[PDB]
Amino acid sequence: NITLILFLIGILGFVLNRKNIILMLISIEIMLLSITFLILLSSLNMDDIIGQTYAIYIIVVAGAESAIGLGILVAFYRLRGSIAIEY
Amino acid sequence: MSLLYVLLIIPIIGIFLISTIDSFYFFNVSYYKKIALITTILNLIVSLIIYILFDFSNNQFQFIQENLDLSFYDIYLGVDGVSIYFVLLTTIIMPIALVSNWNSITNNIKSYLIIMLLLETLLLAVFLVLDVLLFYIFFESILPPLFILIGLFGSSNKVRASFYIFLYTLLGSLFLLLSILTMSSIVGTTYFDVLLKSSFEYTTQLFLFFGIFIAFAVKTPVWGLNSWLLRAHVESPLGGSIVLAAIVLKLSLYGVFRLILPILPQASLNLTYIVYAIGAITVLYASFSTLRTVDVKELIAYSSVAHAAIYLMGVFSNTIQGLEGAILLGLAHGFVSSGLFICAGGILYDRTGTRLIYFFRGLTQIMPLFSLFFFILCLGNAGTPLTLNFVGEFMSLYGTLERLPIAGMLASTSIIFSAAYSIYMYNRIAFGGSVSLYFIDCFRDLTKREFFILFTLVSFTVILGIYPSFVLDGLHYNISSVVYGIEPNASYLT
């Protein structure tokens, strides 16, 4: 239930935000944690170590994609000098 | 290598020689025009050889070559009476179209000749294919060469014209394609010899009819779907216009014989009163409209609309006379409309640079050879006897009157208005005062080239107008196969 509310918070990050692109990166991190938390709790209910394994690979991949996204942001910011959307 | 496949191969060799001869000789443009002309001449020579060997009373498709290496999309060619004369008309017309532009292209001559030669192979393929999908593939393949012909060699408004003829034809053909795909799904095949053997259910026939008729109405064209013809046939180069009016208009007519009369006879019988209302409306509205048209080629283009309505009414008459009249009128309109476009788009437009009728007057005084042929073509466009135009109009209108008298009478009224707009145009150009005061320079009369592409066209219509049997003899048995009905005492002999 908490995991569902957290997914909304990550969803709501995209609704409320017109100009903060950094918040877009953070809202993906919230969504991914919410989905991993749901898998972890379900894996506990169904006594299944595969759920924990799936969550570990989501942490690995979401950590890997955070680094790519920050690198892409750095290449973007090197040329623009701002992460602000003019709106 | 069947004679029919030879027909499609010669124009492709001409394309090869046209586009490679510079690697063997700066080559002169006259060379390209001579390669292209001889190419079409040998194609005409082959079609004449086929006609000598053609048999007038065979229900088998003739000069077919066995493939037996079946694939998904194979090209089978064959000819019978209903297709033999359309093939001949295509082979006669295209050399005349080439000569009609001999001097008036002057740029991108290689592209013009390659496009013209490719159009011949495609249009011939349309009349020769023995499969309904094969029919569609060639009916549509001509749009991109047609689109690029107008844009490369057309007049000032050729951009709007090329778009109109492309999008009208595609949109209608897409509805014909839907109808064709339904047929192949039910039957498993679109080959003529086995699709005609099948029997579609009435409501299937009804919905198959709308899909096909929507395409054939855009291509006839019927009135209200004819904007593309007004634009394309006028903005096109003269050769394009001749091919567009004398060959391309005929594909929907030949397509009624292969796509609706044999498989959709119940739908055709039950919907004739809708075809005839549209056919009657087109005869009147077009005739009144061309009476007020001020562009000479658009007036001549608009006449094609009125005559196409008459042979469209003939093919739906279910009578022997209407169907023979429809092919004979479609053939007759091919020669006469070709001559009238040469007179307007070739003779007048090259001398003056304009097509407005306001600027022409008294041309007979300085140009008596142009007026002599122009009058004979204005008589033929009016359906005067001893032209193949009368034999076709009378037989087409007789079938229309017998099938449904109210439409026959209205379609009959075209005897007045065809004469009306044809002679009125003729007088405002050849007669009607002395030579127009707008001409500063005097004009020369027909050149030898102009005389002989008109004499040839007026010879074909007149000889066929005195002895139409040359064509009717090869239509009697095949036309009989497309009739739907039975007599009380002849049906079911025992």
Partner: protein, 81 residues
């Protein structure tokens, strides 16, 4: 008129022709003339290969049709009861 080798020999010949036209290079210069046999030779090789593929495809499709009438038969015979 669908011969695999004749068509694909010509296809390779047409590829060279279109290529030279695209480069706006002369179609027949005598020192380059070895290329048309080469292009048509490789084209002929592709079509001998397509021959063998078509043979195996025909056998496999023919085998599938038998399995389809076979399935319809034993279903229809089971319905006879």
């Amino acid at each position: 008129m669908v011969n695999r080798i004749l068509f694909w020999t010509g296809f390779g010949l047409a590829v060279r022709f279109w290529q030279l036209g695209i480069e706006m290079r002369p179609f027949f210069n005598r020192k380059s003339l070895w290329a048309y046999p080469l292009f048509g030779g490789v084209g002929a090789s592709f079509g001998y290969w397509l021959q063998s593929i078509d043979e195996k495809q025909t056998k496999m499709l023919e085998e599938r049709k038998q399995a389809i009438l076979e399935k319809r038969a034993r279903r229809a015979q089971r319905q006879a009861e």
